[PDB]
Design a protein around this nucleic acid. Sequence first.
RNA 1: UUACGACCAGGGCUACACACGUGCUACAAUGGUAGGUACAGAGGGCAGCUACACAGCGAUGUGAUGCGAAUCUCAAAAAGCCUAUCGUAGUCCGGAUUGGAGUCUGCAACUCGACUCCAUGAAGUAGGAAUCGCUAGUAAUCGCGGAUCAGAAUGCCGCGGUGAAU
RNA 2: CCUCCUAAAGAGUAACGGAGGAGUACGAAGGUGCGCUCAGAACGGUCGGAAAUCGUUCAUAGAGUAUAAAGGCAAAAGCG
Lengths: 177, 80, 61, 92
Amino acid sequence: ARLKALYNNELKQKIKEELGLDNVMQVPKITKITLNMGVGGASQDKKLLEGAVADMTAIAGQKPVVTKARKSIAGFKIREEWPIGCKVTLRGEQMYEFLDRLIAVAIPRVRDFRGFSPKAFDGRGNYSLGIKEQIVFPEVDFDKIDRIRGMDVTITTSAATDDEGRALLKAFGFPFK
Amino acid sequence: PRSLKKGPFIDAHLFAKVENALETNSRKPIKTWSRRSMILPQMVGLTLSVHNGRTHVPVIVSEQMVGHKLGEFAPTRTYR
Amino acid sequence: MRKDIHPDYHDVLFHDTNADVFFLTRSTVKTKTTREYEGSEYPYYPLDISSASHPASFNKR
Amino acid sequence: ARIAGVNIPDNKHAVISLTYIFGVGRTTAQKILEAVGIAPTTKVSQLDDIQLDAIRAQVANYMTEGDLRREVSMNIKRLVDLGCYRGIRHRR
RNA sequence: UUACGACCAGGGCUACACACGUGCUACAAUGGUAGGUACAGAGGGCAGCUACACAGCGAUGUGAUGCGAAUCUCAAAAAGCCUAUCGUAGUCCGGAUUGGAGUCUGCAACUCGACUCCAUGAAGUAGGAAUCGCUAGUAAUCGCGGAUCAGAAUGCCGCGGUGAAU
RNA sequence: CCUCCUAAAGAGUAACGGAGGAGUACGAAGGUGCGCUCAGAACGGUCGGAAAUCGUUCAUAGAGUAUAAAGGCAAAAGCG
């Protein structure tokens, strides 16, 4: 990952000088990146989930895992332990490569993309963004496709504060505002 | 709409009422029946009372209403 | 990383041809052609756009 | 191909495929192809990347879907919020 | 009979949960589009039609010419034929609705005009019970004129083209 | 036949007293080793909301325990 080798040389010290931190262990870093896909309409066809798992595999470069229903809800017609989503978690080299790819290649491919909301942090430095169409990732090809799916990209960082989280995200080149 | 070569249309009788209103800088609502006169930026800010057939409903003219006719903001029919 | 359960993950040379900027990054994509960078010949992927190229009336008439 | 952020059909002719872009009809596509220099009878699939990016640059002039939908929606809003007759029919 | 008479301005006759009656345009390949190349009749024109030239993507605008017309003009007929393409897709079908910019007529185009241009691209893939017209230059289909009319026909009244089945 | 109360702080204790369950289930839902921690609330996030899946922060248990109730349960007796 080139972004990890760039953060370990330039971005860390730049973030420290920016936030005015008196200790190098205070500057934030991204701990993990989690890609999720709610396929709640599954357990009735169980082919939508197959396609979602394939899309997650191609997008992330890592075999994902099927997430079951933690409770039974009649309104969503779901019973316990029913496969209703897909998730993958990327750490270290895999997450740095994925985030570099997402910022460079894939994030300009969002249709009518003005920017990403800067108030979308949860309040502890972690960011979450939604991708309404999984074709913005070049890994998935337009010829063979099940349908148009979406995905959550949650960036979990070591920042404890909103402002530190967005400073760390913006140091990487994240498209904000 | 109209022809650009002809020029903007404003009734002379209401144009006189606004030449006797923007020099004075009054806020008196000018009461008018000519809905066929286009709102120009000349009287932007003041108030007119446009006849909608039954009553003289008030139209305070704004900055983004110029170019429209005075009747556009005085509906004549009542659906419900 | 568990062995042989993950997809093929290899370096890919993405290239924004509008600004002619390269992005070397491992990815799951399988490109048809392969173009040589300063190192070896990576699978080459053209790009239409990337992070380098993406971004009164009365008086007139 | 991929022009103006959408995936226009590849097996169609250029002048027909480009109309799939919201904001490009057939005469605007004809004018785009006149400037670029490509015959409207050539398939988009057999189009070189250099001329594909030339067509992208030529398209970047006209207000396509990303800007067009915003501008049209705000144009409608300018009448809906104004309370004029046209806006009163627009809301209903 | 200082009003149920009379005059003026604005609005309405153009509203739409809806229903029905007459139609027009379609749902395409016996077709759409782009190039060429043909063949009419009838009617209108000073309350006007405009040759031609230039400007404009266009509607149109300016100059200018002929003609009260078997003289000049509306005006090019379209369907048709040849070539290319589309290759059965809600599409290169369909063109409603909406956004923007204009041209004319007219004191005046908001309610509430007609056209032009660009963008959008809705339903619609042949239609239930039921029901209508037509016996030959007819039906079907294709264009073109006129009355009313400053402007405003998919209606009305006509004209010819191709042209059946039973 | 089981659980609570009546039942008077050991046990037991009646009424055609007041309230509920049982006449099964399971070859794993048993044994062991190893590992894990729930419910809810708030915040952020494509469809996706009051509530699906994902991330964060609080959270001795306000959950779960095959089933009635009681008593228990972190060495979990709960979950893989």
